[PDB]
Amino acid sequence: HMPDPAAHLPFFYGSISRAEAEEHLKLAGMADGLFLLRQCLRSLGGYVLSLVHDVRFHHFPIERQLNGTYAIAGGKAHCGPAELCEFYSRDPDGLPCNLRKPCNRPSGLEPQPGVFDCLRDAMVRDYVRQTWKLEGEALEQAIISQAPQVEKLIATTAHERMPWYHSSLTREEAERKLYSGAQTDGKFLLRPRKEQGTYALSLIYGKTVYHYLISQDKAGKYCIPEGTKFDTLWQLVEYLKLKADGLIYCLKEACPNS
Ligand SMILES: *c1nnnn1-c1cccc(C(C)=O)c1
């Protein structure tokens, strides 16, 4: 069972950072129209089309629409990632150039599972079991056939189930909790602040605790101080595990709550 419908594509890397993506493309010798597909870490169920042209990198976010299709911003809709990559191979339709050489995964390397795989394989699975009591091949398919709005809802409160989320911690209590454990770089927790609906990332770097404000837009996207936007806190954390993006350091291991 592969929860991501792009899992069968040889050029799909799963949940990787932009740096690793660009690394794979360089070792593919660069060249115009060299491309790969990866999971989007900001938009739930989405992808990023990583392309190179004029020996410089391009990254096109692909958003999953409500009706289950996929589209680059202002672009046409496609029923799936596979369909999407095939179309753009035969017609740039806004891209700097058409997809040519697929930067396939090197032998041994599988797609990295991320939030989306976990959302479906664990959380939607349990949601489906609780509501319909399905078991075998009926539980699967049902897992990949839920509406994007249901997946979004589960994902939105998923952080409440994560060990790094501390539902009631002051700034001072967070520091004390972090200093009183292993003071390793990237040790972290997330905590709600007074103002609805703001949160704080508390992390250790150089044996010093740092606090970062997280606020959500009027669009409901969760924003780090650098301004990068995420559908969920869960995605925000998983993203910062792979890229600092205005943090003094990446998130590594959770400071456990209970
Ligand atoms: C995702 N992929 N494997 N396991 N998970 C996961 C992590 C934390 C919580 C949950 C729940 C409660 O479903 C699943």
- CATH number, domain of 41, equals 3.30.505.10
Residues 173 and 249 in one domain: yes
101 lies in the same domain as 134:
no
**Technique behind the model:** X-ray
Residues 11, 107 within the same domain = yes
In units of Å, what resolution does this entry have? 2.0
91 CA to centre of ligand 1 in angstroms: 39
Residues 198 and 125 in one domain: no
Query: Are residues 50 and 93 both part of a single domain?
Result: yes
- Point out the domain boundary residue: 157, 191, 221: 157
Last residue of a domain, one of 112, 141, 166: 112
- Cβ-proximal residues to 56 (8 Å cutoff; 6+ apart), any chain: none
Ligand 1 centroid to Cα of residue 34, in Å, is: 35
Give distance in angstroms: CA of 135 to centre of ligand 1: 18
* Closest ligand 1 atom, residue 158 Cα: 9
Burial grade of 103 (CB within 10 A; 0-12, 13-18, 19 or more): buried
242 C-beta neighbours (distance < 10 Å), count: 18
DSSP character string of the chain = --SSTTTT-TTB-BS--HHHHHHHHHTTT--TTEEEEEE-SSSTT-EEEEEEETTEEEEEEEEEPTTS-EEETTS--BSSHHHHHHHHHH--TTSSS---SB-PPPTTPPPBP-HHHHIIIIIIHHHHHHHH---STTHHHHTTSS-HHHHHHHHHTGGGGSTTB-SS--HHHHHHHHHTS---TT-EEEEE-SSTT-EEEEEEETTEEEEEEEEE-TT--EE-TT--EES-HHHHHHHHTT--SSSSS---SB----
* Same domain for 252 and 176: yes
* Same domain assignment for residues 6 and 43: yes
Ligand 1 in reach of 122 Cβ (< 6 A): yes
Residue ending a domain, among 123, 157, 191, is: 157
User: 139 with 200, same domain?
Assistant: no
Nearest protein Cα to ligand 1, atom 5 = 118
Residue range of the domain that includes 167 = 158-258
Identify the residue whose tokens are 């700097």: 96
- Based on the fold, state whether residues 101 and 14 are members of the same structural domain: yes
| Strands 188-192, 70-72: pairing kind | unpaired
In sequence order, the 6+-apart residues with CB closer than 8 A to the CB of 227 are none
Quote the ligand 1 centre to 237 CA distance (angstroms): 14
Q: Are residues 180 and 248 in the same domain?
A: yes
What CATH number did the domain enclosing 142 receive?
1.10.930.10
Whole-angstrom Cα Rg for the chain: 19
Same domain, residue pair 85 and 8 = yes
Q: Does 160 sit in the ligand 1 pocket, CB within 6 Å? A: no
Distance of CA 159 from the midpoint of ligand 1 (Å): 10
92 and 149 inside one domain: no
Task: Give the residue whose CA is nearest to atom 3 of ligand 1.
Answer: 118
| Distance of alpha carbon 39 from alpha carbon 44, whole angstroms | 9
Q: Which long-range contacts (CB under 8 A, 24 or more apart) does 189-193 make?
A: 189/164, 189/165, 189/254, 189/255, 189/257, 190/159, 190/162, 190/164, 190/165, 190/166, 190/214, 190/233, 190/237, 191/165, 191/166, 191/167, 192/167, 192/168
Number of separate domains in the chain: 3
